[PDB]
Amino acid sequence: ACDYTCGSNCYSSSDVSTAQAAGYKLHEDGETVGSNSYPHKYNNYEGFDFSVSSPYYEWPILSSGDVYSGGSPGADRVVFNENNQLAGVITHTGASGNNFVECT
Numbered sequence: 673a674c675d676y677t678c679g680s681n682c683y684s685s686s687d688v689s690t691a692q693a694a695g696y697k698l699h700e701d702g703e704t705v706g707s708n709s710y711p712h713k714y715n716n717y718e719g720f721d722f723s724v725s726s727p728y729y730e731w732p733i734l735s736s737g738d739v740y741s742g743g744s745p746g747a748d749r750v751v752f753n754e755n756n757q758l759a760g761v762i763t764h765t766g767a768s769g770n771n772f773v774e775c776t
């Protein structure tokens with residue numbers, strides 16, 4: 673079973689942990705990857721009911737299981753805060769335009 677289902681993409685907790693760890697190390701180093709400069713702040717315009725505090729950062733999680741290294745980030749993302757706490761997993765799939773919905 674998938675711990676997070678983003679559209680048709682299935683992710684286990686281990687996939688999330690791995691993506692979050694990569695995103696958080698770049699955040700700590702003040703580095704970014706990709707033309708959209710990830711990880712970057714996630715404003716929570718959608719108003720998700722995250723149980724950890726802000727600020728939040730978004731980092732792509734890939735269905736190939738590879739860690740994001742530039743290029744297309746796809747639709748899914750892990751959202752972590754300053755304390756490296758996971759906020760949630762969200763995706764643009766099933767959301768209009770560039771909005772997000774949560775992974776279930």
Ligand SMILES: Nc1nc2c(ncn2[C@@H]2O[C@H](CO)[C@@H](OP(=O)(O)O)[C@H]2O)c(=O)[nH]1
Pocket residue numbers: 708712713714715716717718730745770771772
């Ligand atoms: N919808 C949405 N995008 C946000 C917010 N915080 C930052 N952004 C960024 O705004 C850009 C336009 O939505 C997104 O790029 P993305 O296409 O690469 O995810 C995303 O990174 C947010 O809270 N909601």
Ligand SMILES: Nc1nc2c(ncn2[C@@H]2O[C@H](CO)[C@@H](O)[C@H]2O)c(=O)[nH]1
Pocket residue numbers: 744745746747764765766769770
């Ligand atoms: N795959 C995919 N990408 C999306 C979607 N909505 C926006 N995108 C953006 O389109 C580009 C290619 O995935 C990236 O910037 C994505 O963030 C979506 O629904 N599916």
Ligand SMILES: [Ca+2]
Pocket residue numbers: 682683684687737
């Ligand atoms: Ca996997």
